């Protein structure tokens, strides 16, 4: 094929500003953004939280970078740092829980504009096929 | 994937994570022929039609603005790779080159995915970027 719209990285691309764009929005709310709101929910995986280090592998983020958004995070006591008896952890409050809990319904509620009528077999595999990418490990 | 609480399974974090990635790297690849993925985008755009298309569609397309449009073509017209929106028999040979570029920089990341997993879901994207 020769024509743009069969390029799959275009697709990936404006796809994935679409949602993105949907989810930042539906979002507003609750003070978070894609990126703050995913810190939140890596926080919130574990009990112990998460280390600083899993973060940046996770979304490809700098180190100054992910230190900003769990300040922005910090700041508003939705997670605290913590150390582990020498890795630094982020772990998530009970209010950062409780946000998160929030926050994801309108996530889910925004990824249900673009993905409900397709069948979830089809999404899933999308999903899967994507996870085989962007976590090769 | 269903209930997950898991930031793996956030099917928009996934896609703007690939995304992201396949971008940069066709943007290297890109490096040798001059373009970036937006010019080489529009050098596409031109290349579809045997002669011709319109400025404000592509905006559209692109989900940019006539602004950065203009600029695109303005790189692309004083390489001679298109003639105010027409490709030349360069852009033409250019833009066969930049694609075999473009798919070896896919292939990195799509290679050992079967065919018809691949396939189906750029069929998926297609449904959701243009209904
Ligand atoms: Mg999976």
Redesign the interface.
């Given at each position: 094929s020769?024509?743009?719209?069969?390029?799959?990285?275009?697709?990936?691309?404006?796809?994935?500003?679409?949602?993105?764009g949907a989810?930042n929005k539906a979002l507003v709310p609750t003070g978070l953004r894609?990126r703050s709101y995913?810190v939140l929910?890596?926080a919130?995986?574990q009990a112990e939280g998460v280390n600083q280090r899993g973060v940046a592998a996770?979304?490809?983020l700098d180190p100054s970078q992910i230190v900003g958004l769990v300040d922005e995070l910090e700041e508003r006591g939705l997670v605290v740092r913590t150390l582990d008896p020498r890795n630094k952890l982020i772990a998530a409050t009970e209010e950062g829980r409780r946000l998160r809990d929030d926050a994801?319904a309108r996530?889910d509620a925004?990824?249900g504009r673009?993905?409900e009528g397709?069948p979830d077999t089809?999404?899933?595999?999308?999903?899967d096929?994507?996870?085989?990418?962007?976590?090769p490990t």
């Open positions: 020769q024509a743009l719209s069969d390029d799959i990285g275009f697709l990936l691309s404006r796809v994935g500003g679409m949602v993105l989810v894609v995913s929910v890596l919130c995986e996770t979304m490809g994801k996530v925004a990824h673009y993905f397709i089809v999404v899933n595999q999308m999903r096929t994507l996870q085989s990418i962007a976590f």
